[PDB]
Amino acid sequence: RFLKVKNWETDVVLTDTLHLKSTLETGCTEHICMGSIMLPTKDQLFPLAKEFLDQYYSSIKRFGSKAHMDRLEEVNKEIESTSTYQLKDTELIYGAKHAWRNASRCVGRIQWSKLQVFDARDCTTAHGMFNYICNHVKYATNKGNLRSAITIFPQRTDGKHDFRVWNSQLIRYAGYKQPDGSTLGDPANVQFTEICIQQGWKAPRGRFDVLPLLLQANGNDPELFQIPPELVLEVPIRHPKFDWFKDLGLKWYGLPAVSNMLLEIGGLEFSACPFSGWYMGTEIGVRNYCDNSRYNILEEVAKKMDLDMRKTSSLWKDQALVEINIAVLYSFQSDKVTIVDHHSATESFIKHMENEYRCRGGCPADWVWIVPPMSGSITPVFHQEMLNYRLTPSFEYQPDPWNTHVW
Amino acid sequence: RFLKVKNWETDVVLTDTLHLKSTLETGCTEHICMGSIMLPVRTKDQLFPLAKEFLDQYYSSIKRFGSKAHMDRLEEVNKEIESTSTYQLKDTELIYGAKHAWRNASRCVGRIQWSKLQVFDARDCTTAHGMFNYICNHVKYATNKGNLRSAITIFPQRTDGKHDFRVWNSQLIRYAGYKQPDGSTLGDPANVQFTEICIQQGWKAPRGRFDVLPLLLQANGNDPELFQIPPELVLEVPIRHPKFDWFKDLGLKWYGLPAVSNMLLEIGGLEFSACPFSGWYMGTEIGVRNYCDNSRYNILEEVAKKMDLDMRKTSSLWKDQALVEINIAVLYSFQSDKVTIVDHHSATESFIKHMENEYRCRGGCPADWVWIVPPMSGSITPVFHQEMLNYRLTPSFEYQPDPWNTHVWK
Ligand code: HEM
Ligand code: HEM
Ligand SMILES: Cc1cc(N)nc(C[C@@H]2CNC[C@@H]2NCCNCCc2cccc(F)c2)c1
Ligand SMILES: Cc1cc(N)nc(C[C@@H]2CNC[C@@H]2NCCNCCc2cccc(F)c2)c1
Ligand SMILES: C[C@H](O)[C@H](O)[C@H]1CNc2nc(N)[nH]c(=O)c2N1
Ligand SMILES: C[C@H](O)[C@H](O)[C@H]1CNc2nc(N)[nH]c(=O)c2N1
Ligand SMILES: [Zn+2]
Numbered sequence: 001r002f003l004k005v006k007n008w009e010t011d012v013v014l015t016d017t018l019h020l021k022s023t024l025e026t027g028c029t030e031h032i033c034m035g036s037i038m039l040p041t042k043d044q045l046f047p048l049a050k051e052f053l054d055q056y057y058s059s060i061k062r063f064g065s066k067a068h069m070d071r072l073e074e075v076n077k078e079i080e081s082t083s084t085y086q087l088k089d090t091e092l093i094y095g096a097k098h099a100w101r102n103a104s105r106c107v108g109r110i111q112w113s114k115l116q117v118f119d120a121r122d123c124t125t126a127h128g129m130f131n132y133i134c135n136h137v138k139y140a141t142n143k144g145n146l147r148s149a150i151t152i153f154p155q156r157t158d159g160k161h162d163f164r165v166w167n168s169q170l171i172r173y174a175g176y177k178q179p180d181g182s183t184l185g186d187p188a189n190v191q192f193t194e195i196c197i198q199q200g201w202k203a204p205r206g207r208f209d210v211l212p213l214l215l216q217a218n219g220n221d222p223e224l225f226q227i228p229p230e231l232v233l234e235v236p237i238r239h240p241k242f243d244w245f246k247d248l249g250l251k252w253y254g255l256p257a258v259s260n261m262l263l264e265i266g267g268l269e270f271s272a273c274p275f276s277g278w279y280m281g282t283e284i285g286v287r288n289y290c291d292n293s294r295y296n297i298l299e300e301v302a303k304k305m306d307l308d309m310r311k312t313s314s315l316w317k318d319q320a321l322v323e324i325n326i327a328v329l330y331s332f333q334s335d336k337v338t339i340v341d342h343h344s345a346t347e348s349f350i351k352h353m354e355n356e357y358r359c360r361g362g363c364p365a366d367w368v369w370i371v372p373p374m375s376g377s378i379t380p381v382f383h384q385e386m387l388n389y390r391l392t393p394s395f396e397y398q399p400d401p402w403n404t405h406v407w
Numbered sequence: 408r409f410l411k412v413k414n415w416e417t418d419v420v421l422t423d424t425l426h427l428k429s430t431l432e433t434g435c436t437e438h439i440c441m442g443s444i445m446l447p448v449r450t451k452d453q454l455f456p457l458a459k460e461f462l463d464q465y466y467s468s469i470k471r472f473g474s475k476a477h478m479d480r481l482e483e484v485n486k487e488i489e490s491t492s493t494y495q496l497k498d499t500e501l502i503y504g505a506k507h508a509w510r511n512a513s514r515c516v517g518r519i520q521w522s523k524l525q526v527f528d529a530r531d532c533t534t535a536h537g538m539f540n541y542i543c544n545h546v547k548y549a550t551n552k553g554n555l556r557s558a559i560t561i562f563p564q565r566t567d568g569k570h571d572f573r574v575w576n577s578q579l580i581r582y583a584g585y586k587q588p589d590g591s592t593l594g595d596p597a598n599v600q601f602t603e604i605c606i607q608q609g610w611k612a613p614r615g616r617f618d619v620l621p622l623l624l625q626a627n628g629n630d631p632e633l634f635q636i637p638p639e640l641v642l643e644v645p646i647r648h649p650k651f652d653w654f655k656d657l658g659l660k661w662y663g664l665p666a667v668s669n670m671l672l673e674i675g676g677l678e679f680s681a682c683p684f685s686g687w688y689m690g691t692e693i694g695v696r697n698y699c700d701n702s703r704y705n706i707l708e709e710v711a712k713k714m715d716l717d718m719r720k721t722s723s724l725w726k727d728q729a730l731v732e733i734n735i736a737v738l739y740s741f742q743s744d745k746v747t748i749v750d751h752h753s754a755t756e757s758f759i760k761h762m763e764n765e766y767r768c769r770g771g772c773p774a775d776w777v778w779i780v781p782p783m784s785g786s787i788t789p790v791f792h793q794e795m796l797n798y799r800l801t802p803s804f805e806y807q808p809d810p811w812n813t814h815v816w817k
Contacts, residue, residue, distance in 0.1 A: 025438070026435065028437065029435065031433060032410070033775075033797035035440050035776065036442070036776035037412070038794065281722075298787070312752035313742065318784045318787070322724055330722075375730060385444050385445065
């Protein structure tokens, strides 16, 4: 019931006790491991509220104090009478920071306590949502010196009045299918790009068209808004050694800002809660650029490198992969836009893991997601055993809202 | 139940029904996933069920479930167990058993090859000397002058657990490791402990960087004995780079035959504690893990130094660049010498084809994503994007602890 975790490179062994505080289900059983699967009332709410407030009061070291008991009473009163309750500002900030702390798939958690929370619970309209999001985008970007932030819109009520950002990220590039049969721009966003057209967006029809926001307030039909172009920081991609690299026409945006997840704090559900940090280079250079279902540029780059593409065993894909990612990193760095490489990020995560074991009794971690999609075993996370379990407050994936909406 | 797996690159969805025949436990619970944890004498009572289950599978695979041959064999085995407390596999059953243990091995990307396995029955073996001879023959047969052939040699099964046959080497061919008084290691640091045991047992160590270890062989629960594999049987490949002429001067070589010798083979509830098996390498096992792990030969710095890369910051990706060059060299060197090897693109692509076939014809293919994804260039291989379900089928290969921890010295 107490579990050990071993690092096979350093022999360091850590004991996990935090896992006994998990409640939610993994999807695994005693017979089947689903570790690699991407998606594995009033009576219900008060145990959730209590559990959260207990840990909150424990963290500020007022557990079992009069203020603790008073608050548990106050929330109990409010649930019984309204069927929900409102978080205090202090509880909101704590909850959001801990949802990040608990995100087992996030390599960047050393930073968890440095998170700027924007309380947008007073928002009532899509226009209001747009304003809050522009202010988030500008604060977080900080002229290239990126700062982690979350903006939190009003909580679910009866679930017929949900706030949602329809984009999966605040900033993404459009995707268009061509009479050609191919795809122009980002193939990931073809479906969403069509929905934007169907609501009236005028697409430049380019390879890198920043999508408009589709914001839904109060369960209403979503509305289109364009982010001011001067708020969207982008980086043209060049290579420090290869002159020709620039002419591939590549760029990426500086701000990764996930907007499709659901924040749960103390049993309350925040269905629109865009958050942002800064990129690890591989996210762009390995995944966005080289996934076959994405911009898929390996073939074009290898050709410009004059590599022999006749057989897989020349590792031409692998050589091109490295150079692409060198370029991504160099370009961000030259432009003073925060980026972290996979060596540095994973090293910091090991240090974070050791702090969390020492000071909290464990750290939930999803090895499948923590190990970078290139050079896995030359990063220290590869050799690190990790236990994966679900703690609250949490971020959860939620389905693309267009499937689950009436007009 | 029907469980779905999706490939996020192709949107191909597959349905697993085979997991319903899984008995053994994963280490995982509804509350905790131990998917990245490396390590997550019977009774008559349990033995006949295990036998029956195995023989039922065997007979149904040969399209004879329920036949008189089937019913008679069940009866024969039952009686043998009741009377002798164990039983002996027929040759046909051993072969089937060993092939399926490989077929069931979740962590093996090489499984498209499962049905082509040469089984050597070494159940008549009685002494360490006999074990040595069997192993030499395996090495020579499997090596096949560089045209590698998969094989397994199966020594007598466990009886009371007091008379186990064991190969003390973790692989038949490995390089010695020598911890120096200044804290440095010469040769393979993974093998320091075993090297020290060999030396204690009387091995005279060459004390170089690539000394092939002697075999330490335990027969019938006796103290193990040392044997040197004839050097002309140990095929090796000096590593060079197609473009970089200085690469040879690093003095690297590797052996051609990967031959795992420390695992336990379970068939029909019988335990084969000595069952060395072998195939051929995927390049990354050598170029990524053996050469570039910090706890192993650790050559990244020296290679990047010779490539004159910018080494002052990790963000230049000097480690990644040198990693790719080292792995090009390994594949190039094996190919040039006509020693079978497979690159990680070809290997993973074949594995996806294998896996899809296995779903169609078997109802599933248990696979451990943590191990199946190669340790470089993960997401540019098709397996990265492939959802997998990990569960335990028997016959199986199991890790067992190193015998020097458990062995009682006579
Ligand atoms: C500060 C720098 C940050 C870095 C370097 C970072 C890095 C990463 C990486 C590399 C992943 C893997 C996901 C992928 O590859 O798509 C990830 C996932 C995730 N991150 Fe972090 N992150 C950062 C900030 C944050 C912040 C501020 C939050 C919350 C406030 C957060 C929460 C999450 C969550 C919930 C996931 C899983 C996302 C999903 O399931 O799609 N991250 N992060
Ligand atoms: C024929 C070519 C083969 C290739 C290319 C191949 C490839 C691999 C690779 C890359 C691994 C991961 C283990 C590691 O990286 O250390 C592995 C593991 C494994 N393989 Fe295969 N393999 C082959 C043949 C075989 C054969 C013949 C058997 C048994 C008859 C086998 C059974 C296993 C088992 C039991 C594991 C897990 C090992 C452990 O837990 O340490 N493989 N294989
Ligand atoms: C199906 C599904 C489930 C799930 N949980 N998720 C997804 C989005 C996928 C995951 N992986 C690629 C893509 N998500 C792409 C961007 N994710 C960046 C995470 C991040 C990084 C740095 C800073 C941040 F604030 C946030 C899909
Ligand atoms: C702790 C622990 C548990 C476990 N199950 N296992 C280990 C051996 C580790 C796995 N990973 C590195 C090292 N084993 C290296 C040898 N693996 C060869 C697999 C192979 C390849 C080609 C053909 C074959 F026949 C067999 C350690
Ligand atoms: C099927 C598999 O789980 C899937 O491809 C995962 C693997 N690891 C990942 N890791 C990260 N960081 N992000 C991802 O999107 C994925 N995808
Ligand atoms: C901690 C982690 O499970 C461990 O390092 C695993 C990861 N994946 C692996 N994959 C393979 N093929 N071989 C290994 O030795 C390992 N090691
Ligand atoms: Zn699991």
